[PDB]
Design an enzyme around this catalytic site. Sequence first.
Site, PDB file in Angstrom:
ATOM      1  N   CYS A 108       0.725  -1.189   0.062  1.00 35.44           N
ATOM      2  CA  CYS A 108       0.146  -0.049   0.033  1.00 35.44           C
ATOM      3  C   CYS A 108       0.884   1.282   0.070  1.00 35.44           C
ATOM      4  O   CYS A 108       1.594   1.492   0.958  1.00 35.44           O
ATOM      5  CB  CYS A 108      -1.135   0.172   1.387  1.00 35.44           C
ATOM      6  SG  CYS A 108      -2.076   1.491   1.252  1.00 35.44           S
ATOM      7  N   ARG A 111      -0.017   4.560   2.829  1.00 36.63           N
ATOM      8  CA  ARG A 111       0.131   4.294   4.354  1.00 36.63           C
ATOM      9  C   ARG A 111       0.362   5.707   5.070  1.00 36.63           C
ATOM     10  O   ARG A 111       0.293   5.655   6.453  1.00 36.63           O
ATOM     11  CB  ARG A 111       0.976   3.256   4.660  1.00 36.63           C
ATOM     12  CG  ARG A 111       0.499   2.035   4.350  1.00 36.63           C
ATOM     13  CD  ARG A 111       1.485   0.749   4.551  1.00 36.63           C
ATOM     14  NE  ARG A 111       2.416   0.851   3.752  1.00 36.63           N
ATOM     15  CZ  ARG A 111       3.716   0.091   3.623  1.00 36.63           C
ATOM     16  NH1 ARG A 111       3.871  -0.759   4.728  1.00 36.63           N
ATOM     17  NH2 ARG A 111       4.295   0.197   2.574  1.00 36.63           N
ATOM     18  N   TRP A 280      -9.182   5.981  -0.530  1.00 34.86           N
ATOM     19  CA  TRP A 280      -9.744   6.613  -1.656  1.00 34.86           C
ATOM     20  C   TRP A 280      -8.758   6.346  -2.994  1.00 34.86           C
ATOM     21  O   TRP A 280      -7.697   5.820  -2.585  1.00 34.86           O
ATOM     22  CB  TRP A 280      -9.737   8.335  -1.481  1.00 34.86           C
ATOM     23  CG  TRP A 280      -8.572   8.755  -0.960  1.00 34.86           C
ATOM     24  CD1 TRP A 280      -7.435   8.971  -1.599  1.00 34.86           C
ATOM     25  CD2 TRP A 280      -8.693   9.179   0.401  1.00 34.86           C
ATOM     26  NE1 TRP A 280      -6.798   9.493  -0.668  1.00 34.86           N
ATOM     27  CE2 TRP A 280      -7.153   9.523   0.410  1.00 34.86           C
ATOM     28  CE3 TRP A 280      -9.198   9.128   1.644  1.00 34.86           C
ATOM     29  CZ2 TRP A 280      -6.565  10.282   1.722  1.00 34.86           C
ATOM     30  CZ3 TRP A 280      -8.762   9.555   2.734  1.00 34.86           C
ATOM     31  CH2 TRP A 280      -7.367  10.111   2.882  1.00 34.86           C
ATOM     32  N   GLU A 285      -4.953   3.522 -10.621  1.00 35.13           N
ATOM     33  CA  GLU A 285      -5.798   2.288 -10.423  1.00 35.13           C
ATOM     34  C   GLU A 285      -6.791   2.244 -11.439  1.00 35.13           C
ATOM     35  O   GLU A 285      -7.227   0.984 -11.993  1.00 35.13           O
ATOM     36  CB  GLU A 285      -6.279   2.403  -9.004  1.00 35.13           C
ATOM     37  CG  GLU A 285      -5.466   2.372  -7.800  1.00 35.13           C
ATOM     38  CD  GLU A 285      -6.023   2.224  -6.493  1.00 35.13           C
ATOM     39  OE1 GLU A 285      -6.389   1.029  -6.185  1.00 35.13           O
ATOM     40  OE2 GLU A 285      -6.023   3.474  -5.864  1.00 35.13           O
TER      41      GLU A 285
HETATM   42  C1  HEM Z   1      -6.421   6.594   1.762  1.00 35.06           C
HETATM   43  C2  HEM Z   1      -6.363   6.177   0.642  1.00 35.06           C
HETATM   44  C3  HEM Z   1      -5.530   5.012   0.219  1.00 35.06           C
HETATM   45  C4  HEM Z   1      -4.821   5.036  -1.047  1.00 35.06           C
HETATM   46  C5  HEM Z   1      -4.512   6.325  -1.837  1.00 35.06           C
HETATM   47  C6  HEM Z   1      -4.486   3.689  -1.089  1.00 35.06           C
HETATM   48  C7  HEM Z   1      -3.449   3.226  -2.284  1.00 35.06           C
HETATM   49  C8  HEM Z   1      -3.302   1.878  -2.571  1.00 35.06           C
HETATM   50  C9  HEM Z   1      -2.991   1.414  -3.844  1.00 35.06           C
HETATM   51  C10 HEM Z   1      -2.780   2.290  -5.271  1.00 35.06           C
HETATM   52  C11 HEM Z   1      -2.859  -0.005  -3.620  1.00 35.06           C
HETATM   53  C12 HEM Z   1      -2.633  -1.216  -4.738  1.00 35.06           C
HETATM   54  C13 HEM Z   1      -3.851  -1.281  -5.338  1.00 35.06           C
HETATM   55  C14 HEM Z   1      -3.892  -2.422  -6.475  1.00 35.06           C
HETATM   56  O1  HEM Z   1      -2.994  -2.174  -7.204  1.00 35.06           O
HETATM   57  O2  HEM Z   1      -4.851  -3.207  -6.458  1.00 35.06           O
HETATM   58  C15 HEM Z   1      -2.945  -0.437  -2.386  1.00 35.06           C
HETATM   59  C16 HEM Z   1      -3.115  -1.691  -1.909  1.00 35.06           C
HETATM   60  C17 HEM Z   1      -3.279  -1.997  -0.449  1.00 35.06           C
HETATM   61  N1  HEM Z   1      -3.760  -0.906   0.473  1.00 35.06           N
HETATM   62 FE1  HEM Z   1      -3.818   1.026   0.468  1.00 35.06          FE
HETATM   63  N2  HEM Z   1      -4.723   2.767   0.114  1.00 35.06           N
HETATM   64  C18 HEM Z   1      -5.233   3.595   0.724  1.00 35.06           C
HETATM   65  C19 HEM Z   1      -5.924   3.288   1.858  1.00 35.06           C
HETATM   66  C20 HEM Z   1      -5.956   1.858   2.498  1.00 35.06           C
HETATM   67  C21 HEM Z   1      -6.594   1.509   3.730  1.00 35.06           C
HETATM   68  C22 HEM Z   1      -7.754   2.193   4.318  1.00 35.06           C
HETATM   69  C23 HEM Z   1      -6.264   0.122   3.918  1.00 35.06           C
HETATM   70  C24 HEM Z   1      -6.450  -0.644   4.963  1.00 35.06           C
HETATM   71  C25 HEM Z   1      -7.095  -0.353   6.234  1.00 35.06           C
HETATM   72  C26 HEM Z   1      -5.286  -0.083   2.690  1.00 35.06           C
HETATM   73  C27 HEM Z   1      -4.729  -1.244   2.626  1.00 35.06           C
HETATM   74  C28 HEM Z   1      -4.122  -1.855   1.405  1.00 35.06           C
HETATM   75  C29 HEM Z   1      -3.778  -3.279   1.235  1.00 35.06           C
HETATM   76  C30 HEM Z   1      -3.734  -4.463   2.253  1.00 35.06           C
HETATM   77  C31 HEM Z   1      -3.224  -3.334   0.035  1.00 35.06           C
HETATM   78  C32 HEM Z   1      -2.771  -4.609  -0.967  1.00 35.06           C
HETATM   79  C33 HEM Z   1      -4.182  -4.960  -1.549  1.00 35.06           C
HETATM   80  C34 HEM Z   1      -4.007  -6.405  -2.686  1.00 35.06           C
HETATM   81  O3  HEM Z   1      -3.194  -7.000  -2.087  1.00 35.06           O
HETATM   82  O4  HEM Z   1      -4.866  -6.353  -3.331  1.00 35.06           O
HETATM   83  N3  HEM Z   1      -5.147   0.843   1.877  1.00 35.06           N
HETATM   84  N4  HEM Z   1      -3.297   0.857  -1.606  1.00 35.06           N
HETATM   85  C1  LIG Z   2      -8.741   0.160   0.417  1.00 38.73           C
HETATM   86  C2  LIG Z   2      -7.922   0.949  -0.385  1.00 38.73           C
HETATM   87  C3  LIG Z   2      -8.016   1.844  -1.464  1.00 38.73           C
HETATM   88  C4  LIG Z   2      -7.363   1.567  -2.636  1.00 38.73           C
HETATM   89  N1  LIG Z   2      -6.775   2.833  -3.128  1.00 38.73           N
HETATM   90  N2  LIG Z   2      -7.362   0.783  -3.572  1.00 38.73           N
HETATM   91  C5  LIG Z   2      -8.051  -0.696  -3.410  1.00 38.73           C
HETATM   92  C6  LIG Z   2      -7.820  -1.590  -4.663  1.00 38.73           C
HETATM   93  C7  LIG Z   2      -8.825  -1.027  -5.503  1.00 38.73           C
HETATM   94  C8  LIG Z   2      -8.441  -1.623  -7.232  1.00 38.73           C
HETATM   95  N3  LIG Z   2      -7.005  -1.117  -7.549  1.00 38.73           N
HETATM   96  C9  LIG Z   2      -9.264  -0.992  -8.093  1.00 38.73           C
HETATM   97  O1  LIG Z   2      -8.998  -0.355  -9.265  1.00 38.73           O
HETATM   98  O2  LIG Z   2     -10.759  -1.017  -7.922  1.00 38.73           O
END
Ligand code: HEM
Ligand SMILES: CCCC(=[NH2+])NCCC[C@H](N)C(=O)O
Lengths: 410, 407
Positions: A108, A111, A280, A285
């Site tokens: 992520c 973070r 968000w 993405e």
């Molecule tokens: C505030 C906005 C946030 C942004 C801008 C952000 C952005 C991202 C992005 C760009 C990815 C990769 C997604 C993909 O390629 O499918 C990611 C992955 C991830 N994020 Fe964040 N994130 C946010 C909030 C969160 C929150 C609230 C959580 C957990 C409470 C979180 C947990 C994770 C996890 C676990 C992954 C890996 C998911 C996977 O393996 O498919 N993220 N995040």
């Molecule tokens: C929970 C985290 C929020 C976030 N930025 N991404 C979640 C994975 C979303 C996915 N990459 C999509 O295009 O729908």
Amino acid sequence: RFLKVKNWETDVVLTDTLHLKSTLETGCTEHICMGSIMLPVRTKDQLFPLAKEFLDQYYSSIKRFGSKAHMDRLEEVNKEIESTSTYQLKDTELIYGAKHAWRNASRCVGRIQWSKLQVFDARDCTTAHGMFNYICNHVKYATNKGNLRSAITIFPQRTDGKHDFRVWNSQLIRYAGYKQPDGSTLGDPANVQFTEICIQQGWKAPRGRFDVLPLLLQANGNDPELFQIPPELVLEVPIRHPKFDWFKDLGLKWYGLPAVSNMLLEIGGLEFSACPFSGWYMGTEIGVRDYCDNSRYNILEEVAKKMDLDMRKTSSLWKDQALVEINIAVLYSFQSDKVTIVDHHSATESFIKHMENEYRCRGGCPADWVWIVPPMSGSITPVFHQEMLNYRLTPSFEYQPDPWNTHVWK
Amino acid sequence: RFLKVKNWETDVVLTDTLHLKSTLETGCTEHICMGSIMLPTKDQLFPLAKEFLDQYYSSIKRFGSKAHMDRLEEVNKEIESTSTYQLKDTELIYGAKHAWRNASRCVGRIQWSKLQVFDARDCTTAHGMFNYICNHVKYATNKGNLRSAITIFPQRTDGKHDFRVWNSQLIRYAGYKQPDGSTLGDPANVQFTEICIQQGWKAPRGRFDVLPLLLQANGNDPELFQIPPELVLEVPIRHPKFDWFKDLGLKWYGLPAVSNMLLEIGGLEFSACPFSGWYMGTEIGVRDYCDNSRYNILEEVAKKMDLDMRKTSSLWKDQALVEINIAVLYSFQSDKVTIVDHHSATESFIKHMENEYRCRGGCPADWVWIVPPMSGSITPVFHQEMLNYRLTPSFEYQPDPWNTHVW
Ligand code: HEM
Ligand SMILES: CCCC(=[NH2+])NCCC[C@H](N)C(=O)O
Ligand code: HEM
Ligand SMILES: C[C@H](O)[C@H](O)[C@H]1CNc2nc(N)[nH]c(=O)c2N1
Ligand SMILES: C[C@H](O)[C@H](O)[C@H]1CNc2nc(N)[nH]c(=O)c2N1
Ligand SMILES: CCCC(=[NH2+])NCCC[C@H](N)C(=O)O
Ligand SMILES: [Zn+2]
């Protein structure tokens, strides 16, 4: 042991010690690196130590390590585990746990926001209808009319593995995909299998290009039930371009709330199989992956045509040109509709600051380079030049097999 | 174990067994992956030599033959008597081609078997090196129709008579620290550029000054030489639509030739083994031109395109980036100088990967390096899982000579 990490753009070198607390494996051996691999009932025995590790970290974080409160809690949990084979987390420990799973999520890039997370305790939930209500509340709070707020809803933890709570949807909000007899796909290809299950379960599919899927919820190990999210709770953005007036006519749009609902949250050894969480979108993405992946909406050609780019030879970089315009369109539309979103430049610059901050205060920041670097313009974002160390820390979010592959139907 | 690799775009799965033949470490452990880290005795020699000769004879369908055995004993006796050995011409060619074949960070390995090998093991002086290098440059350039090649100088002996090409690439632009505090030319070469001045070179103080060769033979101190200007092919950079582009005064050289790495074949170390192929567009357009610590030209180009540089969300950097890369490819193609775009090159690598998996059992690849610096996910390699591991013969990094040389 100390591990150094260098940024080849600033020469800034950092030192990692946090990895010393890494427990899980990585998939890599001293002979082979599996860094680009997508994905390489506990007993009382292996449980208390996991509970102890966690409680030690919790109490240490609140500056109460070694306190009588710290010691009694450990004794309380031990007695509970020996007496019931499991144990319940205090509300504060759950919040703390949830925030750290996020903080420790090496894939992520967002973070820097880890401490700002609204945690909804749905551990008193007992049925699918109950889950639906909790999820509606989550969607409304998080959406906040466009001013998105990060949140997570935590349903009952796993017990004997036969009464698992699960959200069969991969995301709370996602578009249906339908395989046509001619081999083509209407809608989102990524969700074809799940859409077929929804239909088989009774969902009357409008069979359009952007149908919001219904929720398939499983409570206490029972068969899943279908629910339609109140349409008025689903915020969507029509996608148009600031300079290209024909873009809007491509008929594209997307939802504003990204909420991962198929992962497992591990806290102190306990497993929360239903824990939908949302933040968000980072523009790419949607604009790069969801729209341009060949196996997703795949709109590059159609967009390229309207721009009348030279599509005769790849060296004209027509795909690259169309890609930028599309991503410009996504950001523009969301900003214009006042729906929170961040571009890859701002998102990566913030991550680097968060990462350096973490090295200084925490002694490290596990990060998966393959996932952190955006799917477009990689080297013009700072993370590309940043060496990273990937390792697993708990609490954490884990992948879990899709429920339709393991569920015992009743 | 038998590992599998999946392409999430085509669902195609491949099984890797070649990794079971790896020998060197990866830098990673079960607890920590270092995939994004730029750089993670007679008794020692024969086993390495044996391992090599075995794979060599196996490739020629003579494994376990008398010839195989004879050679093995000959080398064996040679190591015991001379503490080292000399490769046959056939083994040298095979070794170099396979070092390339095994280079996990190279996206153009589908061309691995087409490599011209120049045996320069008879070289004794720095001047001899200059001559060999000029010939290499001329042969590889081929008036714009580039041909891959490598020139192999004498192998290491006692580490005190090492042959080294101090330059990082046969052809590269100098960099100088100006009063302004800014840098003139290529920042990446500032240090080397000073060692040249500090050595005699008369730097022209330009933005694109082709650096002189600093050649080291038999452990002696390095000497300077100017690569015949008429042998250095360059391409002025212009855009096919933006007539103002040419005014940026940008140009780049056509021959990419890595010269600071070490070639390892059967335990032997060739510390001076310059090799060359041809450019993939992004190397110049994305990295050399836009890297903040390189020519860092994004803003200038953005300004001339007149786009809103006020907010990052307008993606002016991305727009400008694409244009700069369209210009690089356009110019090289216009002057008839070999060059490949990231789309074509990655597609070829996927094809090569599949050939390697069915004919060899695998293909060591470093995802972090294989995926182009721009448009990552619109290239097939982005969706291709890859296993990284080290196989010999191989090309290794080695310390810059000025940090080890004893004048
Ligand atoms: C505030 C906005 C946030 C942004 C801008 C952000 C952005 C991202 C992005 C760009 C990815 C990769 C997604 C993909 O390629 O499918 C990611 C992955 C991830 N994020 Fe964040 N994130 C946010 C909030 C969160 C929150 C609230 C959580 C957990 C409470 C979180 C947990 C994770 C996890 C676990 C992954 C890996 C998911 C996977 O393996 O498919 N993220 N995040
Ligand atoms: C929970 C985290 C929020 C976030 N930025 N991404 C979640 C994975 C979303 C996915 N990459 C999509 O295009 O729908
Ligand atoms: C003929 C066309 C070739 C193409 C298009 C190609 C392309 C590439 C690219 C894109 C890189 C990354 C460069 C960087 O990021 O600095 C690379 C690296 C590399 N290539 Fe190739 N290559 C070619 C020929 C060769 C040849 C002839 C050899 C060896 C004889 C070779 C050996 C390597 C090695 C060892 C690396 C890693 C260099 C490093 O670590 O800096 N390549 N190649
Ligand atoms: C095969 C490779 O691991 C795969 O395509 C990865 C690469 N990096 C990624 N990065 C992000 N953020 N999301 C993804 O889905 C992927 N897919
Ligand atoms: C830190 C990180 O390893 C570094 O920036 C890498 C990333 N990928 C790369 N890929 C290629 N082809 N070339 C490079 O120089 C790099 N640099
Ligand atoms: C010898 C291999 C051919 C090649 N494409 N690249 C070598 C490294 C070149 C370096 N990336 C540059 O932009 O100059
Ligand atoms: Zn690894």
